[PDB]
Design a protein around this ligand. Structure first.
Ligand code: HEM
Length: 146
């Protein structure tokens, strides 16, 4: 889990992103697919399509809102080590179930702070909080197999 200070920083930098949830979730998933294009092959709905077809698919919103809803839950429970511990091992089992491993979350981790900051300049220290949150997810995936 994150410390109280990291959780607070993550929460503050996430609020303006989540306030325009639908559009920012779509733009997140599109940014992830543009510059890690094999990410799209893990999704049955997107496998084989170019990013232009994904941008126009109505399934974009389904997957992006699901991601932002559960990311929101992680952010607001981040400093609760027992809740975090159970959420992470949910999350890891579900993703290993779809063939997703830690390498894919290393990719998310590398772009996430820059995505958040392009919606709104975050307080100082917010990237390291986000980096640590994804490192917990990456660890849980490794612990669950890959
Ligand atoms: C960015 C952080 C992410 C969060 C918070 C997240 C969250 C979720 C959630 C809540 C689900 C639905 C689970 C269920 O219904 O059982 C899901 C499904 C899925 N996720 Fe993730 N996800 C993230 C990143 C990724 C990444 C990076 C990949 C692969 C590159 C991925 C691949 C998938 C796939 C393939 C599914 C199943 C889609 C379907 O067929 O409905 N997710 N994700």
């Amino acid at each position: 889990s994150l410390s109280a200070a990291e959780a607070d920083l993550a929460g503050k930098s996430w609020a303006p992103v989540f306030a325009n949830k639908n559009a920012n979730g779509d733009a997140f998933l599109v940014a992830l697919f543009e510059k890690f294009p094999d990410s799209a092959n893990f999704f049955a709905d997107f496998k084989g399509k170019s990013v232009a077809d994904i941008k126009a698919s109505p399934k974009l919103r389904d997957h992006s809102s699901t991601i932002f809803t559960r990311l929101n839950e992680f952010v607001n429970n981040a400093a609760n080590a027992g809740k975090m511990s159970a959420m992470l091992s949910q999350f890891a089992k579900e993703h290993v179930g779809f063939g997703v491993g830690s390498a894919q979350f290393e990719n998310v981790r590398s772009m996430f702070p820059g995505f958040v900051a392009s919606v709104a300049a975050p307080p100082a220290g917010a990237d390291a909080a986000w980096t640590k949150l994804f490192g917990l997810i990456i660890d849980a995936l490794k612990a669950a197999g890959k």
